[model samples]
Target: ISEFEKAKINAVRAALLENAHFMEKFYLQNGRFKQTSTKWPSLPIKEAEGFCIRLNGIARGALDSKFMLKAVAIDKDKNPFIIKMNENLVTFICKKSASSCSDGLDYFKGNDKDCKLFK
Candidate 1:
């Protein structure tokens, strides 16, 4: 990928982590995961090529108080790059067949077994 494209991916990862940080504090204070209206940072959706964030677990009254944040690349076929932060927002999972760092989550974990397995 070009440097510009790479930067876009990196931005997406950054935004996700930023949001995760906010959510962690929110959970600590509120005891539940609900989408923050003004507290979370806005996403650069256009730069990220249609990748969108999906929120789950709060609206349906889930008992566990857990939530999911999925950064989905809506354009690409096959793997299409999926980055997920589940429940506590610390543990992350990424999926893409070709490159170890394509989904941008790899930078946080380093190039180790945890990062490569998600490739």
Candidate 2:
């Protein structure tokens, strides 16, 4: 990855940490994660390259007890690191090679073990 791309990824990662904490607090108060992007506090790298954060599970009004928040990089062939959040409020990076990570869910669907937990 070029220096610019590295910087971009770092920026996105930092934002992910902040947002993950925000979502955890939201979950504690609301009993479930928020689906609407606007409900999220704010993210610095909201739009970076082909990567963006997304909420999955039930939609608005129908709140599920569990959800997966993810930062997906569609251009996985070029940028291999993808981010995923577990129900336990844990975030990790999945370094994919050759496999196509079309979206957040797809990235973790079959490559669960390959992901390295981000402490």
Candidate 3:
């Protein structure tokens, strides 16, 4: 992968951590996970061929030891490069594996909303 292509992946990891920081605070007060997807720093769709983000199932916060965020890059050929952040900010990278990436949620799609996942 180009260094430039991976740069955006790192940025999204940072964004996911920030979301975790926020989520922890929210959980401390309300004893509940935030229901909405986080507002993140997004890249243009063309940046990494395509870019996407999503909440991991439900928002289970620090109380549950979960960051609840997932992201990936989709190359022009629909190769999904998974970039995941755990509760404590340890990122797990899936570098566009046909087997591993294709077996999950369609990280292959997104849109231009305020908290848009696909950009």
Candidate 4:
């Protein structure tokens, strides 16, 4: 993968780890597994192609965000889309969670008065 693409994947993995780091059961040790956050669900790149499928059903389902953790990319018309990452896009999606103490519960804040997640 190109450096840019690899960087993207790395960013995503870091995001996930940052978000889920407090969840102790998810942690793995040496020999039991050798992985970085980049390979959370296991970064199996399709040999014939490139790119990685990082998240698993459990992680996706466990998301507690208001947006419901939908897939990232979309079609021109905004329909859900699946991207095929070439070597160029391989690491584009891997990111660590953005959760932070300084960020605060502002994330839990809704755009309008009707915000329910905070409740």
Q: What tens digits encode model 2's per-residue C-alpha lDDT throughout 1-119?
A: 45854575566666566656655656655764544533444433333445666554353211465544566675565456676655566666777421233345333323323557765
Lowest-sum lDDT 10-residue window in model 2 = 104-113
| Model 1 whole-model lDDT (C-alpha atoms) | 0.44
Residue 96, candidate 1: alpha-carbon lDDT: 43
Per-residue lDDT of candidate 1, residues 1-119 (tens digit): 44644465555666666546645545655654554533443332222434545554343222355544555554434223445544465534444421223345323212222221221
Q: Candidate 1 at 49: error in angstroms?
A: 5.1
Give a tens-digit lDDT track for model 3, residues 2-31.
Answer: 675457666765665555565444444455
lDDT of 4: 0.26
Which of the predicted structures, 3 or 4, would earn the higher lDDT when compared with the native?
3
Best by TM-score: 2
Give model 3's clash tally. Answer: 1
Candidate 2 — which residues are off by over 4 angstroms? 1-9, 30-46, 57-62, 87-89, 97-113
Candidate with maximal lDDT: 2
Question: Candidate order by lDDT, highest to lowest?
Answer: 2, 3, 1, 4
TM-score of 2: 0.52
Model 4 TM-score (2 dp): 0.25
